[PDB]
């Protein structure tokens, strides 16, 4: 469907999650006028790739906390925590 809603769980690595994020409140939108947090890069054969994350996915929630209204730095901080796993709910435009 138009927006596929997926729940993806990244098994963290000492090198991180293997993704780059773009966007955030007050920053230049990744697409349209949407200030949300988006996956802009996925490292091939990295943790996020193994978890099924894809470029263009919109990040709605990280470890059960909404990113609604999040500035870029908040999203970065949310993804640089100590947990060995990162659960994210994303919307994927098909």
């Amino acid at each position: 469907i138009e927006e596929e809603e997926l729940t993806l769980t990244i098994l963290r690595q000492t090198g991180g999650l293997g993704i780059s994020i773009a966007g955030g409140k007050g920053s230049t939108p990744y697409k349209g006028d949407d200030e949300g947090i988006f996956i802009s890069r996925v490292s091939e054969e990295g943790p996020a790739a193994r978890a099924g994350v894809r470029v263009g996915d919109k990040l709605l929630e990280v470890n059960g906390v909404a990113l609604q209204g999040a500035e870029h730095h908040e999203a970065v901080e949310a993804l640089r925590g100590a947990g060995t796993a990162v659960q994210m709910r994303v919307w994927r435009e098909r």
Binding site: G16, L17, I19, S20, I21, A22, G23, G24, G26, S27, T28, S40, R41, H72, V76, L79, R80
Partner: peptide, 8 residues
């Protein structure tokens, strides 16, 4: 504004 990207 600025188009921010951060590797994570």
């Amino acid at each position: 504004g600025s188009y921010l990207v951060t590797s994570v």
